[PDB]
Design a protein around this ligand. Sequence first.
Ligand SMILES: Nc1nc2ncc(COP(=O)(O)O)nc2c(=O)[nH]1
Ligand code: NA
Length: 254
Amino acid sequence: VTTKIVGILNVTEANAAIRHATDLIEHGADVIDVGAESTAPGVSPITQEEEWSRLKEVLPEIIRIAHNAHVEVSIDTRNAKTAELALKLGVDYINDQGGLLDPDMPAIAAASSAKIIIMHHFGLPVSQDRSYVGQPEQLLNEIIEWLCSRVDTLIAQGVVRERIILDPGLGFGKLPEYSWYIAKNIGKLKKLGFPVCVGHSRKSMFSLIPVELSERDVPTAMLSTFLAQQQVDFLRVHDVKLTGISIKIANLLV
Ligand SMILES: Nc1nc2ncc(COP(=O)(O)O)nc2c(=O)[nH]1
Ligand code: NA
């Protein structure tokens, strides 16, 4: 099971971010995903310029410390300019949570040879007015078509096919029942032949198993084990130690 641990580093103090990145490295992260725009339901969006001013103080040291430890760095942004600036600093992935919502994102990814995650959503920020209703199978078919259209855009604009990673965006306009349905059927997304990233960690989908937000890391790890068994290529998680345990258990079940 080649599943990589993508440790979440939210910077929404610079010194505290460096300490968190260091702890994520020491507990076994394969990638540090650095993000400065909270996408939580009540959050109003910040500008790309404000986003970058939060990142530019921490990203050089995080990149140095991670690369020194042979850990990669991902930039979690919907803005092509932020991805471009982060790429100049040396990050390894664009985690394009907007899924080419910025029309300049393909040019940035292609001109940088970076790996790119594109994540499905019903618009950002999330809204209860923009939420899927209907048959769960049809939702999965829609997510696949939405992602495939964006894959085509990237390849046409010069992004190599091997560098594209697909993420269904659990929770983004997806009520808990639908997010579990997608996770359970993640193999159908995997059958497209692209690496898959899943971001289930602490998500409101766990409200369905009455587990409140503060206690969700252990339930997250239970699902992490299942996702690792399905050969999901990247898990975007808060607790890197527990996720390492989940992947080792999946390996022992092969
Ligand atoms: N690729 C990807 N990126 C993401 N970025 C942010 C969040 C929001 O979750 P957080 O508030 O816990 O960071 N979820 C995802 C996700 O599921 N996939
Ligand atoms: Na590296």
